Design an enzyme around this catalytic site. Structure first.
Site, short mmCIF file in Angstrom:
data_model
loop_
_atom_site.label_atom_id
_atom_site.label_comp_id
_atom_site.label_asym_id
_atom_site.label_seq_id
_atom_site.Cartn_x
_atom_site.Cartn_y
_atom_site.Cartn_z
N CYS B 106 0.82 -1.21 0.00
CA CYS B 106 0.00 0.00 0.00
C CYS B 106 0.85 1.26 0.00
O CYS B 106 1.61 1.50 0.94
CB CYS B 106 -0.95 0.06 1.23
SG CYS B 106 -1.94 1.65 1.31
N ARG B 109 0.16 4.68 2.86
CA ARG B 109 0.23 4.44 4.29
C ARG B 109 0.65 5.65 5.13
O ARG B 109 0.64 5.53 6.32
CB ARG B 109 1.18 3.29 4.58
CG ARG B 109 0.58 1.90 4.36
CD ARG B 109 1.66 0.88 4.64
NE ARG B 109 2.49 0.60 3.46
CZ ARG B 109 3.62 -0.09 3.51
NH1 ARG B 109 4.04 -0.54 4.71
NH2 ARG B 109 4.35 -0.32 2.41
N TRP B 278 -9.12 6.58 -0.44
CA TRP B 278 -9.49 7.25 -1.68
C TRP B 278 -8.52 6.84 -2.78
O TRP B 278 -7.45 6.27 -2.51
CB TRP B 278 -9.44 8.76 -1.50
CG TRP B 278 -8.13 9.29 -0.94
CD1 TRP B 278 -6.96 9.56 -1.64
CD2 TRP B 278 -7.86 9.62 0.42
NE1 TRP B 278 -5.98 10.02 -0.78
CE2 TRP B 278 -6.51 10.08 0.48
CE3 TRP B 278 -8.62 9.58 1.59
CZ2 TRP B 278 -5.92 10.53 1.69
CZ3 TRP B 278 -8.02 10.04 2.80
CH2 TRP B 278 -6.70 10.49 2.83
N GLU B 283 -5.09 4.06 -10.68
CA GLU B 283 -5.83 2.88 -10.41
C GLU B 283 -7.09 2.84 -11.33
O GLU B 283 -7.41 1.81 -11.88
CB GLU B 283 -6.15 2.81 -8.93
CG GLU B 283 -6.09 1.41 -8.23
CD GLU B 283 -5.13 0.33 -8.83
OE1 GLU B 283 -3.88 0.55 -8.95
OE2 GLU B 283 -5.66 -0.78 -9.15
C1 HEM Z 1 -5.96 6.75 1.91
C2 HEM Z 1 -5.80 6.54 0.61
C3 HEM Z 1 -5.19 5.22 0.07
C4 HEM Z 1 -4.46 5.16 -1.05
C5 HEM Z 1 -4.10 6.35 -2.02
C6 HEM Z 1 -4.08 3.77 -1.23
C7 HEM Z 1 -3.31 3.30 -2.27
C8 HEM Z 1 -3.18 1.94 -2.61
C9 HEM Z 1 -2.86 1.39 -3.93
C10 HEM Z 1 -2.65 2.17 -5.24
C11 HEM Z 1 -2.77 0.06 -3.81
C12 HEM Z 1 -2.50 -0.93 -4.96
C13 HEM Z 1 -3.86 -1.01 -5.63
C14 HEM Z 1 -3.76 -1.93 -6.79
O1 HEM Z 1 -2.92 -1.64 -7.69
O2 HEM Z 1 -4.57 -2.90 -6.80
C15 HEM Z 1 -3.07 -0.28 -2.45
C16 HEM Z 1 -3.04 -1.55 -1.94
C17 HEM Z 1 -3.45 -1.87 -0.65
N1 HEM Z 1 -3.87 -1.00 0.37
FE1 HEM Z 1 -4.07 1.05 0.22
N2 HEM Z 1 -4.50 3.05 -0.11
C18 HEM Z 1 -5.26 3.90 0.67
C19 HEM Z 1 -5.94 3.50 1.83
C20 HEM Z 1 -5.89 2.24 2.41
C21 HEM Z 1 -6.55 1.84 3.65
C22 HEM Z 1 -7.49 2.74 4.50
C23 HEM Z 1 -6.21 0.55 3.87
C24 HEM Z 1 -6.63 -0.35 5.04
C25 HEM Z 1 -7.05 0.15 6.20
C26 HEM Z 1 -5.34 0.10 2.80
C27 HEM Z 1 -4.75 -1.16 2.67
C28 HEM Z 1 -4.26 -1.72 1.50
C29 HEM Z 1 -3.98 -3.12 1.28
C30 HEM Z 1 -4.14 -4.31 2.28
C31 HEM Z 1 -3.45 -3.20 -0.14
C32 HEM Z 1 -3.02 -4.49 -0.89
C33 HEM Z 1 -4.37 -5.03 -1.41
C34 HEM Z 1 -4.12 -6.35 -2.09
O3 HEM Z 1 -3.17 -7.06 -1.69
O4 HEM Z 1 -4.87 -6.62 -3.06
N3 HEM Z 1 -5.15 1.14 1.94
N4 HEM Z 1 -3.20 0.90 -1.71
C1 LIG Z 2 -5.39 -12.41 -6.65
C2 LIG Z 2 -5.28 -11.10 -5.90
C3 LIG Z 2 -4.47 -11.00 -4.76
C4 LIG Z 2 -4.38 -9.76 -4.08
N1 LIG Z 2 -3.60 -9.64 -2.96
N2 LIG Z 2 -5.10 -8.70 -4.55
C5 LIG Z 2 -5.88 -8.76 -5.67
C6 LIG Z 2 -6.63 -7.52 -6.11
C7 LIG Z 2 -6.49 -7.09 -7.59
C8 LIG Z 2 -5.05 -6.98 -8.07
N3 LIG Z 2 -5.01 -5.78 -8.91
C9 LIG Z 2 -6.26 -5.04 -8.96
C10 LIG Z 2 -7.10 -5.70 -7.85
O1 LIG Z 2 -6.98 -4.88 -6.67
C11 LIG Z 2 -8.03 -3.92 -6.50
C12 LIG Z 2 -8.36 -3.92 -5.01
C13 LIG Z 2 -7.26 -3.19 -4.25
C14 LIG Z 2 -7.50 -1.68 -4.31
C15 LIG Z 2 -6.73 -1.13 -3.13
C16 LIG Z 2 -6.89 0.36 -3.02
C17 LIG Z 2 -7.46 0.87 -1.87
C18 LIG Z 2 -7.56 2.25 -1.79
F1 LIG Z 2 -8.14 2.65 -0.67
C19 LIG Z 2 -7.13 3.13 -2.81
C20 LIG Z 2 -6.57 2.59 -3.95
CL1 LIG Z 2 -5.95 3.52 -5.39
C21 LIG Z 2 -6.47 1.20 -4.04
C22 LIG Z 2 -5.99 -9.98 -6.36
C1 LIG Z 3 2.65 -10.35 -12.20
C2 LIG Z 3 2.62 -9.16 -11.24
O1 LIG Z 3 3.00 -9.64 -9.93
C3 LIG Z 3 1.23 -8.50 -11.23
O2 LIG Z 3 0.83 -8.11 -12.54
C4 LIG Z 3 1.14 -7.24 -10.36
C5 LIG Z 3 2.27 -6.27 -10.69
N1 LIG Z 3 2.12 -5.07 -9.90
C6 LIG Z 3 0.90 -4.69 -9.46
N2 LIG Z 3 0.84 -3.55 -8.79
C7 LIG Z 3 -0.33 -3.12 -8.30
N3 LIG Z 3 -0.34 -1.96 -7.57
N4 LIG Z 3 -1.47 -3.83 -8.55
C8 LIG Z 3 -1.46 -4.97 -9.22
O3 LIG Z 3 -2.54 -5.59 -9.43
C9 LIG Z 3 -0.25 -5.43 -9.71
N5 LIG Z 3 -0.17 -6.58 -10.42
#
Ligand code: HEM
Ligand SMILES: Cc1cc(N)nc(C[C@@H]2CNC[C@@H]2OCCCCCc2cc(F)cc(Cl)c2)c1
Ligand SMILES: C[C@H](O)[C@H](O)[C@H]1CNc2nc(N)[nH]c(=O)c2N1
Ligand code: HEM
Ligand SMILES: Cc1cc(N)nc(C[C@@H]2CNC[C@@H]2OCCCCCc2cc(F)cc(Cl)c2)c1
Ligand SMILES: C[C@H](O)[C@H](O)[C@H]1CNc2nc(N)[nH]c(=O)c2N1
Ligand SMILES: [Zn+2]
Lengths: 411, 407
Positions: B106, B109, B278, B283
């Site tokens: 994330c 953070r 947010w 994204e």
């Molecule tokens: C405040 C604004 C926030 C921003 C700008 C943000 C940004 C992001 C972004 C860009 C990702 C990767 C998203 C992706 O490419 O799928 C992400 C992943 C993540 N964030 Fe945040 N985040 C925010 C708030 C939060 C909050 C409030 C939490 C939990 C309390 C959180 C927990 C996580 C977790 C656990 C992931 C990994 C999700 C996964 O493994 O799929 N985030 N964050």
């Molecule tokens: C198989 C799998 C594992 C894993 N850890 N996460 C995923 C989620 C998939 C991987 N890429 C897009 C999708 O994630 C979207 C949900 C996470 C969005 C987190 C997020 C939270 C937020 F508050 C702001 C922003 Cl910009 C992003 C899939």
């Molecule tokens: C193969 C690779 O691990 C996968 O495409 C990942 C790469 N980096 C990423 N990064 C973010 N933030 N979200 C994603 O879903 C992914 N996908």
């Protein structure tokens, strides 16, 4: 054991068995991943196992594994090691070795080309002048007036680590950087320290923005010597833009030939500390890294000013917008002048096909995702969505420290 | 054992010790790096409980105090007897904030300590879950001035009485396969949209159909609920320069709200814990709009821009990608819905890494996820070495419920 990688865009799943041949360590453990850390005189004892392992691979590849010629060569290398403490590669083993170090380079997106590598054997070289000559020939052969051909030149291997051949330049062709008294830099900031060393050795520096550096060459553990590459051998491209006529007046140019000279080639336990190689550019290496890194030419602001982009807030994406235009300019320029170059879309697409073929025919393809994914537009290239396994196979290219930190000066 | 990370743009070297407190396994070995793989009893519970409470009492400057020792005994007692235990409100708030703090993927953070925690441990039915979720959505949205929040449903017991939100995010658009061969709407949600239809949802079969919530309480079969439309803030997408952009008919929702993860605090498992912050613009604009598997609209935009699509080397994809992302940011800002761009977010993450190294001895980070999907190397995170490791409390991925649920 079997390890699967998935492509999240296509759902194609691949199965790696090759990682079972890996021996060198990654830096990672079960508790820590060091996947984004840039950096995570042998004895007779260990050498024959490394030789044996290499020669077994070489002989399998030619479908002669276990042949008399395989057994005799094992025997012959064994003897040479206990008698002389090292051994010499046959030309055929050397060529195979250098091809496979490339094939095995997990940070290299251009490996579809790995089997087409011109190997120049320079193991008879003895002096820095000898090295200068070999390198000019490499450069002229590789450049081929813009129709670039991949090549490597391989100087004598390490003996006692007191008599190393080294190219001190990090690349054969690169521009000087000069730190000014007011703290600004003229030319390429990445090359300031190397430039200072050249100057101290007696280089007469023109003090411009695109001065091609002299080669600094160390033969046989001796102090390095300066040579100027003949300018007619250095192909350069002035950078212009297809639509933006003011682009030319930024005064930018770049060299056609990317040629890494600071790595160490390991083959069958032997260490070739001077093994300059070259291919051709993917455009982003120039347009993104060389021109747009804050620590490099840093031209984003000037390009964005000229485009009259809204520069008052990062959210206009002015940097992103300018970055694209510069990269279009680099590809346009190289193509117009008939100098080989590949765009990051085409290169990553070719890489995924290469990777799949390798999985099918070889059982794997070590790849470092952090390096493979281009430094712009990552997710619209297919590598972004490709899972990759990173491990270390030999033969290999390895980082080595800069020689000005280790060299014992003679005077 | 003490490890350094270097930023290669600034030469700043930081020293990481926080990693020694790492507990869970990364996937990597000394022989193989799995950095880019997406997914790489009473006896078990007491160490986990103790490990957490020790860190909790340390943070409040009361390690080894009367109150510390008293709680360790209380929890120990409760486990020995009931085979689980209950968190105090204070512990729950701290645990949730730390799961965020530890989330190595994330980028956002810097915000971790401003998180509103909604304690829904008293919830018993899917209708109750729905009420709690509507309240979270409304609170978090705050008419476009977004506030971070999490809502925490009751913890796992014997594992056949799990609370789960079946949706992947609280707000997401439906996806339908057409007789045509192509996909209408979000192709990421086809499977879920089928389960909704096959559970009874009347699909409008449009391009941007806000999905119904599918909610599971106490391990019961899940039920459908439509989120009041007036609680789902959406943004029409227009471009500050391109008149035609709006006629593409693009919109996105304001609230990113992950609902399919598992919150582990002190050994306890919260299988339903939707959280929201947010958006960072990329994204929506890079991933949601341009992924080949997603809305995949680059071809359409490039055409309206009349770019040369003959050759990849004209960089028409890259040009169109930038404009899509300019449009996303401009729209959210014009309608005053909180959004952050990738330059500003990644700049904030570097300042946050620095704080975490100074104040805590490290910050686990997954470079592959932290670096934005566009313009990687002109954001500072690209040049920053990061160490990835797993700390608890944590958010973890969990299997999709339909595959697991006893139906
Ligand atoms: C405040 C604004 C926030 C921003 C700008 C943000 C940004 C992001 C972004 C860009 C990702 C990767 C998203 C992706 O490419 O799928 C992400 C992943 C993540 N964030 Fe945040 N985040 C925010 C708030 C939060 C909050 C409030 C939490 C939990 C309390 C959180 C927990 C996580 C977790 C656990 C992931 C990994 C999700 C996964 O493994 O799929 N985030 N964050
Ligand atoms: C198989 C799998 C594992 C894993 N850890 N996460 C995923 C989620 C998939 C991987 N890429 C897009 C999708 O994630 C979207 C949900 C996470 C969005 C987190 C997020 C939270 C937020 F508050 C702001 C922003 Cl910009 C992003 C899939
Ligand atoms: C193969 C690779 O691990 C996968 O495409 C990942 C790469 N980096 C990423 N990064 C973010 N933030 N979200 C994603 O879903 C992914 N996908
Ligand atoms: C033919 C065209 C080639 C292309 C397009 C290409 C592409 C690239 C790129 C883009 C990188 C990463 C550079 C960076 O971003 O810093 C790289 C790395 C690398 N390539 Fe290639 N390559 C080519 C040929 C070769 C050749 C001929 C060899 C050796 C025989 C080679 C071996 C390597 C090695 C060892 C690395 C890692 C370098 C390091 O760790 O600094 N490549 N390649
Ligand atoms: C600390 C460190 C370790 C390491 N292994 N490599 C490096 C080299 C750094 C990484 N990026 C800039 C500098 O790279 C320049 C050399 C690599 C160029 C490889 C290359 C070869 C080629 F033929 C074509 C192309 Cl496009 C690229 C540094
Ligand atoms: C810290 C990080 O590993 C480092 O900046 C890397 C990231 N990816 C890269 N990828 C390539 N191709 N070249 C590089 O120099 C780098 N730098
Ligand atoms: Zn790893």
């Amino acid at each position: 054991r079997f390890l699967k990688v998935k492509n999240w865009e296509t759902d194609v799943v691949l199965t790696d068995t090759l990682h079972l041949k890996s021996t060198l360590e990654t830096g990672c453990t079960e508790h820590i991943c060091m996947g984004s850390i840039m950096l995570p005189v042998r004895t007779k004892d260990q050498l024959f196992p490394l030789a044996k392992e290499f020669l077994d691979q070489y002989y399998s590849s030619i479908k002669r594994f276990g042949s008399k010629a395989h057994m005799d060569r094992l025997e012959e290398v064994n003897k040479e090691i206990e008698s002389t403490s090292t051994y010499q590669l046959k030309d055929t083993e050397l060529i195979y070795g250098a091809k496979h170090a490339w094939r095995n380079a997990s940070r290299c997106v251009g490996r579809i080309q790995w089997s087409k590598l011109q190997v120049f054997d320079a193991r008879d070289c003895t002096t820095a002048h000898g090295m200068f000559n070999y390198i000019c020939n490499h450069v002229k052969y590789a450049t081929n007036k813009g129709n670039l051909r991949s090549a490597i030149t391989i100087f004598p291997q390490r003996t006692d680590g007191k008599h190393d051949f080294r190219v001190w330049n990090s690349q054969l062709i690169r521009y000087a950087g000069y730190k000014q008294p007011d703290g600004s830099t003229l030319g390429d900031p990445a090359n300031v320290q190397f430039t200072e060393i050249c100057i101290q050795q007696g280089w007469k520096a023109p003090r411009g923005r695109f001065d091609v550096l002299p080669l600094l060459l160390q033969a046989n553990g001796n102090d390095p010597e300066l040579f100027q590459i003949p300018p007619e051998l250095v192909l350069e491209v002035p950078i212009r833009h297809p639509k933006f006529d003011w682009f030319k007046d930024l005064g930018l140019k770049w060299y056609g030939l990317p040629a890494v000279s600071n790595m160490l080639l390991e083959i069958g336990g032997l260490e070739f500390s001077a093994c300059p190689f070259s291919g051709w550019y993917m455009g982003t290496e120039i347009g993104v890294r060389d021109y747009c890194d804050n620590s490099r030419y840093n031209i984003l602001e000037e390009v964005a000013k000229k485009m009259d982009l809204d520069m008052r807030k990062t959210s206009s994406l002015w940097k992103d917008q300018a970055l694209v235009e510069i990269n279009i300019a680099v590809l346009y320029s190289f193509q117009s002048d008939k100098v080989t170059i590949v765009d990051h879309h085409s290169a990553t697409e070719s890489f995924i096909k290469h990777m799949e073929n390798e999985y099918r025919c070889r059982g794997g393809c070590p790849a470092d995702w952090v390096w493979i994914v281009p430094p712009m537009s990552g997710s619209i290239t297919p590598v972004f969505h490709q899972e990759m396994l990173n491990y270390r196979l030999t033969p290999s290219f390895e980082y080595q420290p800069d020689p000005w930190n280790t060299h014992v000066w003679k005077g």
